[PDB]
């Protein structure tokens, strides 16, 4: 005839178990994040303690003493990506991927800066050109300046 | 029709593939890997347990020496002692005063608990994994058979012949060296038989419980009894089995990776969800229905009605069934995006019947094969609220465009604008 | 499905919101704040007469 | 919240009504014997002292 620790208080958060917890005696709690990354935890708990567990997508398990092991689906709770705003609702996609979006966005921020400076050169060089053939003769009667319109001011001709 | 299928290793959920035999009616699968018990190849190297210094009763020669000999008992510690005056029930009894000799001897022996409460080392190799695969097949509706993983083993239990694995995910959660205790299994680098430092784990090291021989490095050091009294100072480290029960490490069923459970039973590691298994079945052709007997369902329509962007089968979709005959119609999404609760749907003459499913992409564009009739059940899904219960049926997470398509096409448009600015300089140039 | 709802303070009329739980059939509300009795914190300072 | 302060919440001492979020969960008695497993958080009045 043997031990048993009082049941936990399960509390939901986004991919996270808050657990206000309150034992009778020192209880060894422990878990197993079921990824091939185990990332287990152990701690004897005698003092009541609200704890936390970063649950992953595939699952975690939970062992309140010799009370049987629990298990938990924590998929999303940050609301995916509905859309009726410009971009502050994309946080939903960030809150589900706060590892790949930080780099995936900075990637998206990077390539536009790539596409910026390449557009700088392949505009300003090509804006420096098409006036060097034109603004060196300086009469230059061609009203097809209307292709750059960043290097400007013809001679009324 | 020997339906090869790569298949994710995950225990508690069916895998309702679809038999696309050209010529007769297709048949659904329902392959639920109810267990993944492993049973690697192992070797009992030595039991350990806490010692018992079961002292043999010392000699007391009253006037002169008694030389001791090194008896072959395990860790037979024996040391002659003089200079006693042993008070035994009548005051002393040996009439000399320095020639009073006392020979203490003590050897190590397995506890009585060693038989029953005992750690247990192992050299652990890989072995061969197993499963009680249920298939509630087709219209067969049942077989719950124990199988193997090695990719030529059938198991003709029921009517179907099925070949499994070998799995690609060779992570034996057991390490090479393992200690085992009752039910808590420890992937511990036990030192070895024959060596274990006293106090450290394996101070006692018996091959098995019966084995009278052992290795007892306990640092058992006898000291002389005090002030002319009969007793046996045995100075000894309490066992490395005493510790290892309260300064130990945690169990592999509480620290393993990739999702395993354990037993002191054939030394399996159940339900290790990791990787895929290339599974292939030879169905009984009798179980097939010929194609000309199931209703042809085409000229249909499918649409979600309340798609739940979730794990539990919250996704639903009516289907405007347009049948020819009336009867059953097995269903499946050949795309892994959608996992469906219903294997089979009954049909009247061109009615409509909703099914349940689950997805992972906001815009589930998954085909649905209603007994040789494909259809896209395109739509949009909603996130849930209530995520603290056991494991999913979805298991299909992948890459899941509202600011990417014309964004990056617009990102490109800047650099696409380049070489149509450049090389048009070549034209203005000529 | 814990149906949060901002809701006008007004007594004698229901507020028939709708539970949009994803997965099962929705259910209507009928929330009629039949009373708004207040009972502030007070102190008897002195009777007069 | 049970375990937290005010798991028991009675208006006064006389008040027969109260609020008891103690997470009191009965479990089945063991092996065919009469008793009452009550699995419960010791009070948030026990802690708080
Ligand atoms: C075969 O795959 C099935 C996948 O669900 C599972 O088989 C389940 O076995 C249970 C016990 O035999 C059945 O429960 C019984 O169902 C009947 C009919 O609904 C009820 O009258 C019984 O009360 C109920 N038993 C209990 C104790 O509640 C399940 O119905 C059955 N599953 C299905 C879909 O029918 C197992 O996963 C697997 N079988 C194995 C591994 O033996
Ligand atoms: C989560 O739990 C940890 C304990 O590891 C604590 O430090 C942290 O403050 C908690 N966060 C909450 C309750 O938001």
Author numbering:
A (entry chain H): 264 to 420
B (entry chain G): 1 to 400, 408 to 437
C (entry chain A): 1 to 49
D (entry chain D): 197 to 245
What does the primary publication say about this deposited structure?
To gain insight into the molecular organization of encephalitic alphaviruses, we determined a cryo-EM structure of an EEEV virion derived from a SINV-EEEV chimeric virus to a resolution varying from 3.5 to 6.5 Å, corresponding to an average resolution of 4.4 Å. The EEEV cryo-EM map shows overall conservation of structural features among alphaviruses. The E1 and E2 ectodomain are resolved to a resolution of ∼3.5–4.0 and ∼4.0–5.5 Å, respectively, with the relatively poor resolution of the latter due to potential flexibility. The capsid molecules near icosahedral 5-fold axes have a resolution of ∼3.5 Å. EEEV neurovirulence, HS binding phenotype, and avoidance of lymphotropism are linked to three basic residues, Lys71, Lys74, and Lys77 (“Lys-triad”), on the E2 ectodomain (Gardner et al., 2011, Gardner et al., 2013). Here, these three E2 Lys residues are part of an exposed β-strand and loop on the surface of domain A. N-linked glycans are attached to EEEV E1 Asn134 and E2 Asn315, which are each part of the glycosylation motifs Asn134-Ile135-Thr136 and Asn315-Phe316-Thr317, respectively. The EEEV cryo-EM map accommodates an N-acetyl-glucosamine monosaccharide at the E2 site and a disaccharide at the E1 site. The icosahedral capsid shell in EEEV consists of an outer layer formed by the chymotrypsin-like CTD and an inner layer formed by the extended NTD. The E1-E2 dimer interface has a concentration of complementary acidic residues on E1 and basic residues on E2 ectodomains.
